[PDB]
Amino acid sequence: ADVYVPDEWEVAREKITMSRELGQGSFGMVYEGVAKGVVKDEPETRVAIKTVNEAASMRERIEFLNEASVMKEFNCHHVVRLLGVVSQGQPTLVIMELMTRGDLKSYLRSLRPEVLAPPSLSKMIQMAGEIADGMAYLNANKFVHRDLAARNCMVAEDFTVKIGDFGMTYYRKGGKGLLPVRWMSPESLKDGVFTTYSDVWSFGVVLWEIATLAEQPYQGLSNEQVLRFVMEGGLLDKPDNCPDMLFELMRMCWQYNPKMRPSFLEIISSIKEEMEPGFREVSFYYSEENK
Ligand SMILES: Nc1ncnc2c1ncn2[C@@H]1O[C@H](COP(=O)(O)OP(=O)(O)NP(=O)(O)O)[C@@H](O)[C@H]1O
């Protein structure tokens, strides 16, 4: 059945130290801490430590390990990075790049007027560019997320937004659990079809999440009713004071016909100029890899 083969990603648990908890995960408590020599020319690094509770069986601890391993394949500045693993011995761990600000959704709800500035067009274009960049990288690497949502993106100390670690199981498909209707494309709801295009659809919804400081998409309607609405050409409303240009993107990512929607590279291409100066140096888009 299940088995985990140790590899070069292994790290000595003596190099890892946990200061405090960040939050409960699917397999157990997630902590914050420090790891030595997990980054090039970096003696120590602050990291996120995912663990599995003692109550966990072998299969679970192994499943935890094989799931975290999907991230071994990826290396993008705009995708949260795996830094190591501790499979040998009890407190099965996984060391991840630390995103001090949490998931994008929680970060957006945090600016809720209920005293910092909301996000300005400039700020939003940045997050969108970063998210689109990590998605273009992933799609370029034959992977279809299938569960892109603000809650699945993470925010770094310097406010850089990245795509959180994911699970997996031709184009590989991510996604795990009961997929949420409010982020699904019409063709996904109708035929169960997932593509780079339906990832773009979901992208438009997170732009809408951003623009609404994370309101519930199709708020007021049941998922059951959303299923039909969306399949019927129904779309989300233009947020109260949403920048025209921002809503333009949304509308294009929401073309009923998948082929009519832009790719993440085309999304980026059309907003790259409104990106920060550093983008050119860290982006997949401007990387040698993109071609
Ligand atoms: N890389 C990270 N940086 C900062 N915080 C993190 C990080 N990864 C997870 N967390 C936090 O830990 C808690 C659990 O997060 P969660 O995203 O649900 O992980 P999980 O255990 O993989 N389950 P799920 O992602 O729902 O399948 C939350 O409080 C997160 O903010």
Ligand SMILES: [Mg+2]
């Ligand atoms: Mg998660």
